Design a protein around this ligand. Structure first.
Ligand SMILES: NS(=O)(=O)c1cc2c(cc1Cl)N[C@H]([C@H]1C[C@H]3C=C[C@@H]1C3)NS2(=O)=O
Ligand SMILES: NS(=O)(=O)c1cc2c(cc1Cl)N[C@H]([C@H]1C[C@H]3C=C[C@@H]1C3)NS2(=O)=O
Ligand SMILES: NS(=O)(=O)c1cc2c(cc1Cl)N[C@H]([C@H]1C[C@H]3C=C[C@@H]1C3)NS2(=O)=O
Ligand SMILES: NS(=O)(=O)c1cc2c(cc1Cl)N[C@H]([C@H]1C[C@H]3C=C[C@@H]1C3)NS2(=O)=O
Ligand SMILES: N[C@@H](CCC(=O)O)C(=O)O
Ligand SMILES: N[C@@H](CCC(=O)O)C(=O)O
Ligand SMILES: N[C@@H](CCC(=O)O)C(=O)O
Ligand SMILES: N[C@@H](CCC(=O)O)C(=O)O
Lengths: 270, 260, 260, 270
């Protein structure tokens, strides 16, 4: 029985191939997550069919309805069997699905438009108006936001740290809305906001987008927290233990190392 | 019903209290893992008593006898119910005990004494002038033993075919041997231990290059035990509340007995 | 019995002199390969007639029809008895024709228009700004097609999925494309042709990096032919006597119409 | 039927392992040739055992008696089945044995003791008294020899180049004899001759010995010849064609190059 693998359209995890008009099957998509799924199927022998969520969301809880949505939502109700995608392991998600061991470390970072090189002997130096989350919260000239129905927004909502609570209170009462519906949308907002928008996205995607052309964006400060991506699986499913074992084996053999190297650094430029 | 907690005497995870002679119970222990165990007990709601494993071993398999030693052996054979300790998550361990989510990330790092002629691990592998080794019955010797990348196999072969013995009984012994080798012996250990040692007096050691791989420490539980899910949820809650970062800052950066 | 000698019009291997309209027979051809064929005939003691393959193809298999083209096809199907030409020795060719000892070492090289921004092949593969291709129906394209190294697979995949066609019909066409691309196109070709081109006017092309691999040119004969051993012995004798070195110096460095 | 492999004791081709006192079989040797033979057996399946020639010579035809010796000699008379060794493909050797395609390229080079760095602003300049073969043959202060019963001595024996003829005429009338019995003997002679002895050997061994400590020897000039190493096989044997095919598919792609780089660079003591 072929099981359905749900995934999100997010570079470089899964990107549509250029010649995807005539290709049919699992060959339409390329990236980190397709190779991860191939290695998972090479460890334990099973047939998989890639799919993309229609709503295009990672997964969250809707207000006052207590209904899961996104990848997590459709994995809970049983229309998907395994989620090999950059899904952030969180306490709220672990209560409804099973998570494997993290296959990629990450953290919340800050994305701002790259300032022009300054000159005052005749050396160029890099000066930025934002250097950490504290100064970003204190200032008001630069707006900042997160991705709707994601993990960073959830983290800021329930955060008890004073600075993160201040940032979330600003975000909730921000007119117009600073939350975007896609990572690419937020990155484009940063690009054409003339440095007046700051995108709080994941460290991996931030580094990948920084490493690619036209590389007009930069990452300031450090990671706000430490988290990881885990291959999700419905509670009480036969695939949980084999998937965890496969992830552990792939981490020990360093396959994840080479996949990250060839999907984040090899194809980067500038 | 008190819960037996096995752990190893490793700094800054578990230390001995300065006045532990006049102290009994769990109050004679301190460190990152003691605070972690206290937080886990508070969240889950159980009474626990901290115990040190009889042999200072993290856990491995002996010479073709299929017997687990150290904390892993303590958990497998029912001598303990949980292990809050710097236990690395590995394939050979997960098959015999249940691991929680990694509460602290780490990697493998090279420690040398204070031009940096060693740089990355490739130069250390190509050059046989400076000796290097690992901790026996740990998660690094077995990592090099089971590796397949040519550089790691080369280093493991040099380790096994080394005269005299290069593996150290304790990580403190390795630190001391690095210190009194006048920059001739290098030590391979976890990045967190390397940072803690290089940040402590006399600060004569340092970490060179980057992490050879990426792993993490997880709370270990006997296979098929009722505590696995509660401690996993507790670890996730602690990470989401940012108290794991608070504990790491307290035991790694709050004191900082060095100039940096 | 005149022996038919197939060869390709490649410089400085075979050239049509300067006034070949007034010349007939073998006297209208000149180059390294013409001199090599003359020496081979002198050593073995046979009369030969130099002929140019009808299609400017070195040799390959067509689209799943199991038909050899070019000089290799000219030799397999009995149209010729020997091929004194810059024919690279490859696994697929040796199974159908008999190769002699390599009379001239070679390698795959990268040439760009006149500190190179790419230099090594890894940087060229990583950067998609500059296009790169090979000679069609040759040996470099089949080397990239049959390669298993990750970088070479990436380059081959970029070559096949390139709009418009990045391959060239002739090495001269590739050189012209490199000259007219204003540094936007890099040609992948043999090291010997690269050096010859860069040692000729107007000297606007230069070779970057090292050599991707090491190969050689051999004298090819039909499988199970009586001429294989004599030509192998003649090639060995010429190599030992320095005849090949003298010919290479004459046709690569003696003229040298370049500033270096 | 298990065939025997004849090989010379040369580095980094065949070196006795450190723990070779108790090891038995093919595990007593390490180097280039042991992996070459292993890959040969893997590509075309056969059983092989490693043997070393008793006389310790590469092979040459002695005059008068007209009896071959060395690896070539013992391959001719049928006491060995294959010579997976750094055997130079020679015209006289191809008249009695079968040679495969060259797996390694090489040339005849000059080895001299490294002089001390010049003092004179405060830059160190590398100046040597010999930079080619013409100036080596034009002087008499520095002696130069070759390896007895090898390919370089045979090349100098029947060379019609004026410079090489002068070198051979000097060598044939050198008292005491400038010919050495092994590569190690010639290297030691160069090292402890205080720069008065020059060694002519293959470029591969010269580069390898230059790359390792104490690296007190240097290679001057370019390669005199262009020659290769071929896996020898008795004339008319049924293993010649499979051996040649195995050599070809081994040289195809990065396998032979990988082995050469791993054996010539990991000894990077200098
Ligand atoms: N370098 S990376 O971010 O792509 C990355 C990150 C991680 C990897 C592997 C890689 Cl390649 N494996 C570890 C896993 C291995 C075992 C120890 C921790 C988990 C279970 N998680 S991780 O520390 O989140
Ligand atoms: N900064 S740190 O090393 O003390 C650290 C490291 C890590 C933390 C939390 C902290 Cl504070 N949580 C993550 C866990 C949280 C959820 C996502 C990945 C695992 C499950 N593991 S981690 O990436 O190994
Ligand atoms: N200098 S060169 O490229 O013209 C060149 C290159 C080579 C020459 C001779 C010359 Cl002059 N001979 C060797 C041959 C001689 C014997 C040893 C290897 C083959 C058989 N092949 S080679 O290494 O491909
Ligand atoms: N780089 S090297 O000297 O180790 C080296 C040298 C040579 C290799 C392969 C390597 Cl790795 N293969 C070629 C062979 C391949 C085919 C073309 C020429 C012969 C038949 N001979 S070579 O040009 O003598
Ligand atoms: N990976 C996140 C979404 C990305 C983000 O919010 O930055 C999640 O699983 O919810
Ligand atoms: N902490 C590791 C051992 C430390 C080391 O090997 O450096 C373990 O749990 O096995
Ligand atoms: N000389 C090659 C073709 C030229 C090339 O590929 O560069 C051959 O004989 O196949
Ligand atoms: N490889 C040479 C020996 C080395 C030398 O004489 O330079 C041979 O087979 O004869």
């Amino acid at each position: 029985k072929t099981v359905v693998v749900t995934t999100i359209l997010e570079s470089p995890y899964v990107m549509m191939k250029k010649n995807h008009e005539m290709l049919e099957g699992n060959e339409r998509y390329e990236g980190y997550c397709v190779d991860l799924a191939a290695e998972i199927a090479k460890h334990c022998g099973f047939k998989y069919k890639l799919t993309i969520v229609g709503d295009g969301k990672y997964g969250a809880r809707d207000a006052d309805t207590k209904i899961w949505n996104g990848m997590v939502g459709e994995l809970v109700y049983g229309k998907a069997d395994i989620a090999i995608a950059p899904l952030t392991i969180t306490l709220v998600r672990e209560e409804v699905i099973d998570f494997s061991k993290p296959f990629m470390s990450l953290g919340i970072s800050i994305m701002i438009k790259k300032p022009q090189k300054s000159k005052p002997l005749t050396v160029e130096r890099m000066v930025s108006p934002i250097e950490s989350a504290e100064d970003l919260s204190k200032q008001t000239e630069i707006a900042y936001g997160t991705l709707d129905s994601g993990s960073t927004k959830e983290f800021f909502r329930r955060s008890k740290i004073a600075v993160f609570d201040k940032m979330w209170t600003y975000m909730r009462s921000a007119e117009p809305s600073v939350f975007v519906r896609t990572t690419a949308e937020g990155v484009a907002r940063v690009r054409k906001s003339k440095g007046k928008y700051a995108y709080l996205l994941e460290s991996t995607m931030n580094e990948y987008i920084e490493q690619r052309k036209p590389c007009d964006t930069m990452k300031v400060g450090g990671n706000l927290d430490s988290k990881g991506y885990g291959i999700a699986t419905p509670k009480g499913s036969s695939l949980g233990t084999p998937v965890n074992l496969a992830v552990l084996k792939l981490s020990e053999q360093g396959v994840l190392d080479k996949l990250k190297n060839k999907w984040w650094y090899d194809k980067g430029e500038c």
